[PDB]
Amino acid sequence: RHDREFVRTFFTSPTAVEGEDDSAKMLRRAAGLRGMQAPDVWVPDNEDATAPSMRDEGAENIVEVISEQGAEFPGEIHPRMVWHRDSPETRYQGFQHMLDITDPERGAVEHIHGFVIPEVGGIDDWKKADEFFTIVEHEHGLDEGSLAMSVIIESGEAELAMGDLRDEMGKPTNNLERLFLLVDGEVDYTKDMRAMTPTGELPAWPELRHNTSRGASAAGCVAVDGPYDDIRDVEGYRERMTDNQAKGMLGIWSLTPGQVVEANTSPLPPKTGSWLLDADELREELLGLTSYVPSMDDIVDSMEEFEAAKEAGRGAIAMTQSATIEKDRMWDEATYQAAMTPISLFQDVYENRPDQHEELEERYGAGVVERAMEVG
Amino acid sequence: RHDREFVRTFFTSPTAVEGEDDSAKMLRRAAGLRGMQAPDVWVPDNEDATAPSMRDEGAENIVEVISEQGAEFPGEIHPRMVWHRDSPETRYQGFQHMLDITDPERGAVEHIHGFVIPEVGGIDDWKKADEFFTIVEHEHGLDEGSLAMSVIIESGEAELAMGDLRDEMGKPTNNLERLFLLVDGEVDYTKDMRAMTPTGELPAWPELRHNTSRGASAAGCVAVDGPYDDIRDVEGYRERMTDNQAKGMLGIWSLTPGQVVEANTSPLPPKTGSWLLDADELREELLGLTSYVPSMDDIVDSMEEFEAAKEAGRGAIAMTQSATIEKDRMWDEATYQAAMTPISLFQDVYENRPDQHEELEERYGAGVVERAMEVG
Amino acid sequence: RHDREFVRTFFTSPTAVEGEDDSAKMLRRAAGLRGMQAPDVWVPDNEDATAPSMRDEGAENIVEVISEQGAEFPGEIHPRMVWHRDSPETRYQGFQHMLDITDPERGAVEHIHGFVIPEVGGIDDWKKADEFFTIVEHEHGLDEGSLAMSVIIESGEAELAMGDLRDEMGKPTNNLERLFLLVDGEVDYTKDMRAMTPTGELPAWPELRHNTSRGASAAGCVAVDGPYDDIRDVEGYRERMTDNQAKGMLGIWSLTPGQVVEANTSPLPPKTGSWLLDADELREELLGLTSYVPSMDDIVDSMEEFEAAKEAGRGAIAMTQSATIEKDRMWDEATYQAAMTPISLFQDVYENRPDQHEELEERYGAGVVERAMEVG
Numbered sequence A, B, C: 001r002h003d004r005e006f007v008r009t010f011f012t013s014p015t016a017v018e019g020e021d022d023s024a025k026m027l028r029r030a031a032g033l034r035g036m037q038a039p040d041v042w043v044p045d046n047e048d049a050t051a052p053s054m055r056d057e058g059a060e061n062i063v064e065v066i067s068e069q070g071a072e073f074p075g076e077i078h079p080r081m082v083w084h085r086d087s088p089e090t091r092y093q094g095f096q097h098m099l100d101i102t103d104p105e106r107g108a109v110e111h112i113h114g115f116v117i118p119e120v121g122g123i124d125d126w127k128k129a130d131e132f133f134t135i136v137e138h139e140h141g142l143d144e145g146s147l148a149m150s151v152i153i154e155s156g157e158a159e160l161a162m163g164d165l166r167d168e169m170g171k172p173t174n175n176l177e178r179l180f181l182l183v184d185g186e187v188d189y190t191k192d193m194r195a196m197t198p199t200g201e202l203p204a205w206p207e208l209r210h211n212t213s214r215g216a217s218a219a220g221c222v223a224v225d226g227p228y229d230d231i232r233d234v235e236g237y238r239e240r241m242t243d244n245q246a247k248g249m250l251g252i253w254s255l256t257p258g259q260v261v262e263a264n265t266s267p268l269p270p271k272t273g274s275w276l277l278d279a280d281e282l283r284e285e286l287l288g289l290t291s292y293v294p295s296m297d298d299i300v301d302s303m304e305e306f307e308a309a310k311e312a313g314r315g316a317i318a319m320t321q322s323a324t325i326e327k328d329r330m331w332d333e334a335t336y337q338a339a340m341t342p343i344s345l346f347q348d349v350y351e352n353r354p355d356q357h358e359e360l361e362e363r364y365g366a367g368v369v370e371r372a373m374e375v376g
């Protein structure tokens, strides 16, 4: 239903960073990208890319930058607003921001193709965002249905909601034919699913990607994968994109300008070639070969470190494990929430298993224990 | 609900081939197969096995061969008609053909257990085919419900439609208790899902096979896997069948008489044996080890080559990649449609990304570019 | 909605074993377990752990043991009753047993947090168990909703029923807000799905575990994996738990006191550590490396052996394959039902393929054939 039949790259940029020369600096730069460096879909991100205390200034920055530069951005612009299925205050905040951003007197809306809504739940929560899009349109004299809605699938409920989208979109009490991208959010989804891994890295969730690809094909939407947060792992990003393309998920989230270029080229067929034989800078194949398996103490450390960064006005940071090499991973509030699971489980167990207090004290030490019991 | 509780082999045969001694030659031969050589379910295929210009003659051939030989065919006969969820002309054509085929004056219908319907969409499209079966029955005085319907699951919508089949089949406004096999169609499904792989070979779609197996168990149907189009790869076909059987999908499509024999034997338990130790004709293990990774140019070539074969009256052909060995893959219209994805994406990108025209010209050459922009 | 936010271990114990000093012996012992040895959820099992002729005595044993010992059991107690979606007699039996067990005069109900229902089908079969819980509550003056219901997902229909649980639980004609655990039952599920493997071991069913984890997250329930029946394979159990935790399924069934300890420790984060490098008692790594691939004859043997054990008053047994090592697997009625698939398929084929009788006689011998044709 939308102009872009295929979307290779979905790139988010923080809308307002603190410390500050120009808080809009990341948007002004991403707005000047061109050719293979520029994304099919660019997402100024007022949600997890942006510290909370910074989001009001972020939405002004969005209006200001797209005002001045959006006219020749060559991809499509769809900013991410705040939303959450379980928070009416957050829904209202994302609606008020969209309403400000599309005021036609401000010159941004003419260059905005739609908005991206995170944390949606079942289909009746998607109809609530849809109704806000309709109200915004009517309040600002835009054509009905002209702002595309894209959603981030980052809960069990939203994953199930993709099952009946075709007939729910047909109901004439909604305008959900405006739906454009269905985008996985593996980080908050890991959180919602309560998953954990020995390294703390994201599970691969092949079934989620299968279901988001199916859902888009059945409903006329386009499926995009979520963030590959080991931002320096060029080879990993390529292998993930190839795995995605075999599920029919041909687009991927990009966190950096370097990911944009890789993800723009990856699904393009090759120049020539090429026969393969399948019988059977050192730093880079070394990081490819090492992993760390953090202790309960390590986990709390990563969280406090992130906590401090966010409180200082930074939404997203590259966090580092160093040895012997230097392993980098993009952290934000989602990453923080997801990392907490092994701790929430420990706490549940301590609270409810007084008979195990002694072995847990043997296993951790009474000091590590009392620290864990403090978090969140 | 049907006589065959288990179906190992679902074998399709083209119903009318051009060039021509006897256009029915493939059906007359498949109709004489016996023992391990004969399939549990034999499908004379008026759809993708058969060139379009040939399908009217194909449906006559179906009546003629089953008339003369169907009496002692030892498996069940279920011919595939044309259908498509998005084409009313195609639905009507498949219904008119079924109506001709079951005319009891012609002596074919007494040896036909049902029909196979390709390209179904959501459950309301399955009810449309069901209604045609009911009309055919009544028009020709067959008992209501006596023709089995089997469907090919080869879209995202049909995959989702298997979720509520039990209660939709119970509604008394339909006769969908006639449902027999739910059969995956990986080739058109790859197309519908927009998937792609570096070699052009089919993705494995484990979740599709999981869901078709689940759907059959929940609704009282029997699940069958789709075609394994590397028809000479005996070892690959065996490994796929073993992988299927572990999902509860115990039947598989067969494209050749040699696949019939393999697929008839594979799920039978062994004669004796057998302990395995898991610590760690040359041409055949060589093809097992090589793959080709085609260029944008290669892709267009395979398509034009197929295009020409179909236009000459051949629906299915073995296409060949040669090196140094000879790699064979069954091609039909589905294969053609599926192969086009990397091209449709390139075209989308060229059309919508004028700012990338220059790097794409560097990457391919202006000649390769203008060729790609021509396809389909 | 329930006190335990996380459940690591779900341990079943037979409620009545024949031969007999004290038929309650397994319950009395499991009831004395403490610390890391004691499960978060303990399941006295009146269903597949217990021979049928023994289940009336089993439900008395349940009342007697929990009466005397349940007060200081430190985990939660949820006994498994009999049930089946396709047997009204079995539903009624499980309800009469729950009604006996919760009589407040008998002193067991004060220490029971809920009951576990096996073999559920679609959501309307779950509402039938729910209604029995409500009747039991009212008949015995318990607070409405105070007995938790947990279900075992061990059919295709129940797997699909998890898709709409959130809104079905909201209907005020039911009390399904009492739902607590959604627990996979891989053994009966293998049966229901008709799956088979060359060794007879359980398929891994990653999608089932994905869907049960999703279903629990969407509906506010807790997801637990099914039994790991190679009870001596410590390393296998650990790898399965790690694979589960990456799907968000953080609990697992335990069949032995040794599994309880392993599964209690596995999802706890580590004491310290630990960097890994990924470039590349003998009996135990030997069993880790061998497998057996049974013949049609072998399969019947395992079944008759199990059949005899059950008829003698034993519900669960460790069955043994010996060579050269000793491979142990927990067998019960589910295992028996699941093992029969390769035989049911052979029988279907023999019955319906008279033209294959001769090759099947060549392949097996007329004696092996006539034996297979006798089973069940």
Ligand SMILES: CC(=O)SCCNC(=O)CCNC(=O)[C@H](O)C(C)(C)COP(=O)(O)OP(=O)(O)OC[C@H]1O[C@@H](n2cnc3c(N)ncnc32)[C@H](O)[C@@H]1OP(=O)(O)O
Pocket: A012, A013, A014, A026, A027, A029, A030, A045, A048, A049, A185, A187, A188, A227, A231, A255, A256, A257, A258, A316, A317, A318, A330, A331, A332, A334
């Ligand atoms: C689950 C979720 O919600 S994920 C989506 C939310 N998170 C995000 O969007 C994170 C976005 N990305 C970022 O914030 C940054 O890339 C970081 C912090 C992760 C990494 O920072 P760096 O180490 O600078 O990355 P890198 O070295 O590739 O940067 C290259 C240049 O492009 C700039 N750049 C990096 N990422 C972006 C971006 N997302 N948008 C605009 N400009 C960017 C960098 O600032 C750097 O600028 P310079 O020219 O002043 O040096």
Ligand SMILES: CC(=O)SCCNC(=O)CCNC(=O)[C@H](O)C(C)(C)COP(=O)(O)OP(=O)(O)OC[C@H]1O[C@@H](n2cnc3c(N)ncnc32)[C@H](O)[C@@H]1OP(=O)(O)O
Pocket: B012, B013, B014, B026, B027, B029, B030, B045, B048, B049, B185, B187, B188, B227, B231, B255, B256, B257, B258, B316, B317, B318, B330, B331, B332, B334
């Ligand atoms: C996604 C989909 O729609 S797939 C289902 C649609 N496609 C089909 O059904 C394709 C069916 N198969 C075929 O058309 C052919 O097998 C081909 C063209 C792919 C390969 O042809 P060949 O290379 O002959 O295969 P093969 O060497 O195994 O053939 C053995 C003999 O059996 C015949 N035979 C092969 N396939 C079939 C068939 N499907 N039905 C009847 N007879 C067949 C061959 O013609 C050959 O005959 P001969 O005795 O005159 O030599």
Ligand SMILES: CC(=O)SCCNC(=O)CCNC(=O)[C@H](O)C(C)(C)COP(=O)(O)OP(=O)(O)OC[C@H]1O[C@@H](n2cnc3c(N)ncnc32)[C@H](O)[C@@H]1OP(=O)(O)O
Pocket: C012, C013, C014, C026, C027, C029, C030, C045, C048, C049, C185, C187, C188, C227, C231, C255, C256, C257, C258, C316, C317, C318, C330, C331, C332, C334
């Ligand atoms: C698909 C399904 O329905 S699966 C769930 C149904 N099946 C079951 O629950 C099977 C439960 N487990 C058992 O019956 C037994 O563990 C068996 C028969 C499989 C194995 O028996 P063993 O070889 O004794 O196991 P193991 O050596 O670990 O036993 C250690 C001790 O704990 C006891 N024990 C073992 N399992 C249990 C149990 N499930 N509950 C209580 N006590 C147990 C043993 O009897 C043994 O006792 P001892 O002190 O007298 O020697």
Ligand SMILES: [Cl-]
Pocket: A046, A047, A055, A059, A080, A081, A082, A093, A094, A097
């Ligand atoms: Cl916002």
Ligand SMILES: [Cl-]
Pocket: A085, A086, A087, A088
């Ligand atoms: Cl709310």
Ligand SMILES: [Cl-]
Pocket: A121, A122, A123, A124, A160, A161
């Ligand atoms: Cl929903």
Ligand SMILES: [Cl-]
Pocket: A213, A216, A217, A221, A222, A223, A248, A249, A250, B193, B194
């Ligand atoms: Cl898509």
Ligand SMILES: [Cl-]
Pocket: B046, B047, B055, B059, B080, B081, B082, B093, B094, B097
């Ligand atoms: Cl037809």
Ligand SMILES: [Cl-]
Pocket: B085, B086, B087, B088
């Ligand atoms: Cl139509």
Ligand SMILES: [Cl-]
Pocket: B121, B122, B123, B124, B160, B161
């Ligand atoms: Cl549907």
Ligand SMILES: [Cl-]
Pocket: B213, B216, B217, B221, B222, B223, B248, B249, B250, C193, C194
């Ligand atoms: Cl089946």
Ligand SMILES: [Cl-]
Pocket: C046, C047, C055, C059, C080, C081, C082, C093, C094, C097
């Ligand atoms: Cl019972």
Ligand SMILES: [Cl-]
Pocket: C085, C086, C087, C088
């Ligand atoms: Cl019933």
Ligand SMILES: [Cl-]
Pocket: C121, C122, C123, C124, C160, C161
């Ligand atoms: Cl249901």
Ligand SMILES: [Cl-]
Pocket: A193, A194, C213, C216, C217, C221, C222, C223, C248, C249, C250
């Ligand atoms: Cl859970």
Ligand SMILES: [K+]
Pocket: A171, A172, A173, A174, A175
């Ligand atoms: K409308």
